[PDB]
């Protein structure tokens, strides 16, 4: 008998079926930050990685496996073939093309769409019941693209959206007030990044409305220039990109936070990008961030935030602009 | 009054002194993997980062700060100046040079020695009571260098050593047996990397000696070639370097595991590199990995492993080789 | 040589000094629930237990010690003598008397005051710099008592207060809305228990004011009777006492949450009982729960909640009542 | 519209099917310690409690629910009817009768059997695919009883067995050596409690066999009396029972450790009680503790520890004695 059989007596020929499986597609800096954050939060019993760069994919997988002693996720797999992703509960898309020198963002949009046309059908083939969490940028457009290609109902297609923008907002608010972001509440909604909308009416500590304490909050008359807090939500992302080349740690932690609510059926509220047609006069198929209740079925509910006329008009303008771009995309 | 003062009444404006502070020096892939792993294990109330590349250093710090909402380490700081490291309990050195084309390894090591001659006095100046955890390679030589330059007692200078090699051993052992590495026990000692020593006599599951079950274990007569487990401990690191360019995740996790024992005073046993003169037959000032008990005072004790004649001769040969190299380095 | 000395080489025999020590005084159901919750959140490197019942104290300590394999708090000690508590960062008082048949509540409180007159000087003797977290009831009165006897500055004497009441409020609010309590925000302030004050103006999800959506919120005109949420905050505690004899698990979890903010210096906001003279219109030395920022210095700051006339009159009435009782107690 | 519907827009009529559900039956001290330890380790997305004492059951449930803010287990339910347990992955039995004054242990055996004849059929009715983890004493007899009544294959019926005995052994070994139990390895096998067997051949630190260092280890000639370490594994349990009335914290943590391996499919090795017929000459249906590999299918494999003739004869004697009692039990 082999040493294994001398040492170990086998009771069961196991069926080996994954119960809490997560897949990450695209193992760049963002995908691997998502991966490590999920691993260190014990959110999955199996982690699958997919990419098209075969050596990079296998190297990252092996690096994680070598740390298995320090983890409680017993199976880490990888491959270019999507059979490694079968029966995932949650599939996180972090794939994208590399912007070339002198290439505009507009050119990236169709290249990432072309990547999604290859990825998303293979995801559905092997995990027809999964939740899809889209991180690749432009995230609101690509969440729509993923929704359309997958055929999924809208509860099962989730865009990272303004989850990270809101985390940045609360960090910066916390720095102004000397309070941990966990206790500084404030919401950034709409489009991820440049066009996001700070909802000044919801900014509060311990339920005390900042806007009621300081009616000029967020306006141009504001002597304390709190609008600069939202300007820095946008500008600080561009700054990290300039300083280190890309962002990764903050989005990875924010993605693991969303995965936690989904895998643990927590029904916490997150600002994520969701199919918003039927609200705010929006009549087109577009994805924008609103506060959503997240659990094991994806987005089961959303909060209807009371918006001023100006705030509603900004969200409607994002919806119109997104539909304008989406109708020109080739599927 | 300002909004903050309208909202918040201050009881004490006190000079915050750090209680559980860790510094990582060098924010390459290895340093940041250490940083993220430490953050997600709640080991510190303050994390300081140091490097010489100023924009990269600030970008990585800010990226971590943007994730504060998802963390419980309230202060993350950085700078090229070592006053940001003051009063650290643990200082992790992952700094190093990159080999230039056609540069000999000996010259690369001397460049790393020169880097340590700059770093180590500045660390001591601002945290004279810290523990030093050396990760930069060649790790056993540079741990000696750190020990010589710092003036620290040997309990407070620890080299990552074979902690990671042993983790790889147990992952590979677990894969052969179908058992989690947490339950697969085995020790790789001596030098990190190619010259490491697999202690076949300690390989066991549930206290069952594999060597006693299988007396050919690890020999050339072994029909199952268990020696290939140790060969892959060495080769897989080179393979990961070839596939993705470097290793980072597994070393980051293993470093956070050592930090956990030190910061929480666990007195767990780890294979780390320590000044071994007078033990294991070594008569020179060199650092080799043996099982060490780690706690709030660093290495308080070490385990005297019973070695065969061959294993003892291999460690003595490593010590002779390390001593020859160290006297060829300029301090 | 002994087996230990054959196996282990000692580098330093040093006098272990505790770095992150917590003491719980009183090992009833409440004290032990605090103990287990603190152990499972890795908040301390040393846990000390104190009581006057010597056999029970030793049995509980040993029970915890038998679980050390599953914990990461390496030292658990106990004793009737307070030298076991030396150098605690945080001291949690859950000690109290049991009401005797036919004994008036005022006499029961005086017996608890007498207990504090024994405990508090001995705590101060061995940990003069600790933070005091008072859980014993009546908690607001006894927090004042602890503050008066200790001589501590007010930032270092904290009463559990309405931390638990607010947790119950948010659980009940979450149940009504189908949202996790982590995302349901609402504050119960003032006295712990029957006289607590629900701040309807701060009740919100995602920054959306329920009171603004529903102006009758909490009034008698409310067709949905949201006032019953606060009524159940009070009644459910009495119900648990009736059904199982006492409450323990929820208070233990809420105490560990406060300990987490203090031990890790998080500067999160909690509703805890603090010396409120000069704020909120109170002119006597009394402790009432307001939102406080908690960190390594205890209460460094507090939030000034905007109150209605009725809410302010209720807090002033609580202060008048507390002051009348305190002058009827013998110190 | 109601306030809920004004605030929240519903996307899905959810099916509400539990994915990682655990049930605890019997909410005495042991059951509630299991419950809190499982809750604080995030092992379940739904926790169900069952007992026959209806008020106590509802009070404990409510106490846990009031701490929901501090947990990430979103549904806690209870009831005397087993429909609350439907679709559990893992069902933990901690039910038992109260020993009356002057009542022998022998009388308790049939009373606990009678309790199991009511419980186990109802568990199977609502969770036919679950794993059963038996904690009630006498644990090896009652694990057999549970196996027989359930009809389950032997991989899905697990007795707590010697898991806690081994944890106590490693704690006491750690205290002798000054090393954390996590790094002190040693196995207690066979029957839980009085008749358990310390396997001296497996006792080691860092793979260094204590028995080889000290051949008198565990014998009567041992000047250091290491056999007293195993005597205290037994005696310390009786001591805690004498000092505080019962044990609870250590078993609760040990049970949560087993639940972790099962729910996370970790395939760690634990000494748990398993149907051992076919090994050691045992030819009867009995449950004894050996090192077992635990995962999502229960006990999938077990380690065949090399035993001395004396050790094998003690295990065989336990098997004979257990079968002698079991054949007299009424089903
Ligand atoms: N939604 C948010 O808040 C933010 C999203 N992001 C976005 O994440 C995405 C990835 O970011 P990085 O990792 O820095 O970029 P990256 O270029 O380093 O990595 C992208 C990976 O996608 C892989 N890829 C390309 N085609 C593929 C295909 N058919 N199938 C599988 N993999 C494929 C690539 O090989 C690459 O390894 C970017 O679009 C980035 O803008 C970045 C941070 C914040
Ligand atoms: N001991 C072990 O088990 C392992 C150790 N390592 C070693 O970790 C070290 C770092 O690895 P990588 O991050 O991949 O290399 P890297 O070259 O990307 O990172 C080195 C960083 O040190 C910085 N640096 C140079 N001089 C400095 C100085 N005086 N002060 C502060 N920073 C300085 C550099 O700017 C760089 O950011 C390497 O030496 C590597 O061999 C890598 C994996 C396993
Ligand atoms: N503030 C809050 O939100 C809540 C606070 N509590 C309060 O916690 C306190 C303890 O609650 P339980 O454990 O259920 O009561 P308990 O009577 O079972 O525990 C009290 C323990 O204090 C010990 N004791 C008496 N005098 C002592 C002295 N000088 N020194 C040390 N120990 C002494 C007693 O031996 C006893 O073990 C009670 O006063 C209770 O009202 C209970 C739940 C919620
Ligand atoms: N295997 C091990 O390592 C150890 C096991 N134990 C055992 O755990 C068991 C429980 O211990 P404790 O909580 O201290 O005892 P306990 O008597 O306080 O609690 C037992 C609970 O079982 C309930 N019960 C009785 N009949 C029931 C029925 N048909 N259905 C549902 N519930 C029923 C009882 O009402 C009671 O609430 C005991 O047998 C104890 O010996 C204790 C610690 C270590
Ligand atoms: C006609 C056209 C319409 C859209 C086009 C386009 C485009 C494109 C292509 C590559 C990258 C991006 C992009 N990445 N990125 C990042 N953010 C982070 C972070 O860490 O936050 C890291 S990189 C951001 C946010 C910015 C840093 C703060 C954008 C901008 C963007 C723009 C538009 C939508 S949207 N609502 O239209 O989908 C978005 F969601 C985001 C954008 S061309
Ligand atoms: C005269 C001279 C002799 C030696 C010289 C030299 C040298 C040098 C310079 C840069 C990097 C290294 C080096 N990095 N590295 C890594 N490992 C990992 C991981 O993921 O494990 C990632 S990179 C390894 C280990 C190998 C991958 C498995 C080495 C080799 C080494 C050699 C010698 C000592 S030692 N015992 O003398 O300290 C070591 F500890 C390690 C080595 S110049
Ligand atoms: C002249 C006098 C006036 C008052 C006297 C008095 C008194 C006394 C003596 C023992 C126990 C208590 C008490 N315990 N207890 C618990 N709560 C929990 C929980 O799980 O929440 C578990 S038991 C509560 C709260 C209630 C269950 C919901 C009280 C009442 C109380 C009363 C007064 C103050 S106060 N503001 O004056 O400090 C308090 F803080 C609390 C009270 S004698
Ligand atoms: C003819 C007969 C045969 C058996 C009978 C019987 C019986 C009985 C009835 C109630 C309680 C027990 C019992 N509980 N208990 C606890 N332990 C702990 C802990 O914290 O460890 C807490 S209480 C222990 C262990 C001891 C404290 C250290 C026993 C003893 C025992 C005896 C027999 C088997 S077995 N192998 O036959 O199943 C066991 F598993 C355990 C036993 S009458």
Coordinates of N, CA and C in Angstrom, one line a residue, chain D residues 56 81 106 108 120 126 154-155 170 193 199 220 245:
Chain D
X56 N -37.6 29.3 28.5 CA -36.1 29.4 28.5 C -35.7 29.6 27.0
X81 N -41.2 23.0 17.9 CA -41.5 22.3 16.6 C -40.3 22.3 15.7
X106 N -26.0 5.6 35.6 CA -26.6 4.6 34.8 C -28.1 5.0 34.6
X108 N -29.3 8.0 34.2 CA -29.2 9.1 33.3 C -29.1 8.6 31.8
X120 N -34.1 12.7 17.7 CA -33.4 12.3 16.4 C -34.4 12.1 15.3
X126 N -36.8 16.8 9.1 CA -36.7 18.1 8.5 C -35.3 18.4 7.9
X154 N -22.3 6.4 8.4 CA -21.4 6.8 9.5 C -20.7 8.0 9.3
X155 N -20.4 8.5 8.1 CA -19.7 9.7 7.8 C -20.6 10.9 8.4
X170 N -3.4 19.4 25.4 CA -2.5 20.4 24.8 C -2.3 21.6 25.6
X193 N -13.4 11.2 28.4 CA -13.4 11.3 29.9 C -12.5 10.2 30.5
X199 N -1.8 9.1 23.8 CA -0.9 8.4 22.8 C 0.5 9.1 23.0
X220 N 5.5 4.8 34.8 CA 5.6 5.0 36.2 C 7.0 5.3 36.6
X245 N -20.1 24.0 38.9 CA -21.4 23.3 38.7 C -21.5 22.5 37.4

